[PDB]
Amino acid sequence: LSELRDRQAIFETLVAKGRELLACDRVIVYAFDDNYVGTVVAESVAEGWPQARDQVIEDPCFREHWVEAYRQGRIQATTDIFKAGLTECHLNQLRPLKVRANLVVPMVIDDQLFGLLIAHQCSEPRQWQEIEIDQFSELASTGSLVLERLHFL
Amino acid sequence: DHMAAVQLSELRDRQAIFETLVAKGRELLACDRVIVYAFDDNYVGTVVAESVAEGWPQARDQVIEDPCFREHWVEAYRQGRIQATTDIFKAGLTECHLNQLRPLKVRANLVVPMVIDDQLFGLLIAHQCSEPRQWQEIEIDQFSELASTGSLVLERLHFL
Numbered sequence: 001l002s003e004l005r006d007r008q009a010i011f012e013t014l015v016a017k018g019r020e021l022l023a024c025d026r027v028i029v030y031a032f033d034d035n036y037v038g039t040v041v042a043e044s045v046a047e048g049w050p051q052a053r054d055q056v057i058e059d060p061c062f063r064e065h066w067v068e069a070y071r072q073g074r075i076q077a078t079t080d081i082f083k084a085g086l087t088e089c090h091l092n093q094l095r096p097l098k099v100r101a102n103l104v105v106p107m108v109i110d111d112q113l114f115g116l117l118i119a120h121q122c123s124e125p126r127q128w129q130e131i132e133i134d135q136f137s138e139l140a141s142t143g144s145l146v147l148e149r150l151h152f153l
Numbered sequence: 154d155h156m157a158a159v160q161l162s163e164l165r166d167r168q169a170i171f172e173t174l175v176a177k178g179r180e181l182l183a184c185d186r187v188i189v190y191a192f193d194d195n196y197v198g199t200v201v202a203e204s205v206a207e208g209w210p211q212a213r214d215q216v217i218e219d220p221c222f223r224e225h226w227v228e229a230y231r232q233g234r235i236q237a238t239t240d241i242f243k244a245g246l247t248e249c250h251l252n253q254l255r256p257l258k259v260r261a262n263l264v265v266p267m268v269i270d271d272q273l274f275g276l277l278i279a280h281q282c283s284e285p286r287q288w289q290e291i292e293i294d295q296f297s298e299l300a301s302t303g304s305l306v307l308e309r310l311h312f313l
């Protein structure tokens with residue numbers, strides 16, 4: 001990882017390592033351009049589960065305020081999205097992907113947010129453990145160090 | 154939930170990087186000691202940080218002999234070598250090398266390089282002192298990932 005000098009290779013590594021790390025159903029990188037508008041840029045998904053790129057998922061074309069919360073280091077660890085008080089529109093974004101559990105960590109260095117590293121469990125609800133959250137978020141941070149290095153180099 | 158209050162990836166000071174490497178490494182492995190042996194610009198290495206379990210000797214409390222020049226064994230680590238030694242008294246080490254570790258009461262010895270693109274920042278080292286100990290593949294991978302993360306942050310300091 002530390003040696004990668006290509007954006008897409010980094011994103012695909014993160015996504016493979018993340019799913020391996022958590023043994024969950026899907027890991028995704030939702031990456032931000034300069035306007036903090038985001039797109040799904042990579043996905044690792046267990047066989048048989050829906051792939052993001054096969055769906056049309058609505059996503060408002062502006063930077064919503066949760067972007068700033070992640071930028072400051074918010075982590076979302078949701079055991080079951082149907083019990084978490086999500087908006088209907090948000091549930092509708094995750095429904096096609098058959099999400100139950102939702103773990104969202106920032107890929108951020110010095111308050112520059114490169115993206116979000118996201119895990120889903122689809123088969124059933126899943127309580128994310130502290131040590132999984134720590135390891136997944138260290139993976140995000142390492143990926144972020146190498147994304148940032150791209151600019152320097 | 155929230156990212157940790159201090160992150161290795163957010164450190165912007167050399168010595169802080171070494172001290173968090175050594176704290177996190179000893180917690181990861183639950184071993185007796187973790188050190189960083191860091192290289193200066195002339196490839197001279199120095200123990201710059203240590204985290205050690207209660208009751209075991211501290212590196213800085215000892216006089217450990219160490220040839221003033223860069224030895225040949227350094228190149229193997231620059232190139233990515235890892236040494237994982239279950240019991241240093243049964244590993245065919247030289248007497249002089251044994252005498253560097255005796256004062257620290259080392260039995261097991263794990264050595265991973267802190268290296269990016271052929272720049273060797275140091276070695277991250279773990280000791281078990283209480284008993285011999287066979288380092289597991291999972292431990293070696295995790296310890297080595299920590300070392301590489303530390304190396305990314307040392308490198309960044311140059312750029313910054």
Ligand SMILES: *[C@@H](C)C1=C(C)C(=O)N[C@H]1Cc1[nH]c(/C=C2N=C(/C=C3/NC(=O)C(CC)=C3C)C(C)=C\2CCC(=O)O)c(CCC(=O)O)c1C
Nearest residue numbers: 028030040052057058059060066076087089090093102104
């Ligand atoms: C519904 C289209 C929409 C309206 C209208 C609105 O104003 N905002 C939403 C619902 C909404 N969504 C989130 C959080 C996220 N939205 C994401 C967008 C995506 N685009 C995709 O292609 C995709 C498939 C993986 C998604 C999920 C993302 C990445 C997030 C953050 C991750 C997550 O929380 O799922 C919110 C904020 C929820 C909260 O934190 O309060 C809202 C209101």
Ligand SMILES: *[C@@H](C)C1=C(C)C(=O)N[C@H]1Cc1[nH]c(/C=C2N=C(/C=C3/NC(=O)C(CC)=C3C)C(C)=C\2CCC(=O)O)c(CCC(=O)O)c1C
Nearest residue numbers: 188190200212217218219220224226247249250253262264
């Ligand atoms: C003994 C003074 C000496 C002579 C003479 C010589 O030519 N080389 C040695 C013995 C020797 N040491 C190593 C490898 C290491 N030596 C280290 C130096 C240290 N300085 C310290 O303060 C200290 C306390 C922690 C140490 C251990 C270190 C860090 C190493 C690498 C890590 C390890 O292997 O313990 C060698 C090379 C042996 C090999 O790997 O083939 C030799 C011959």
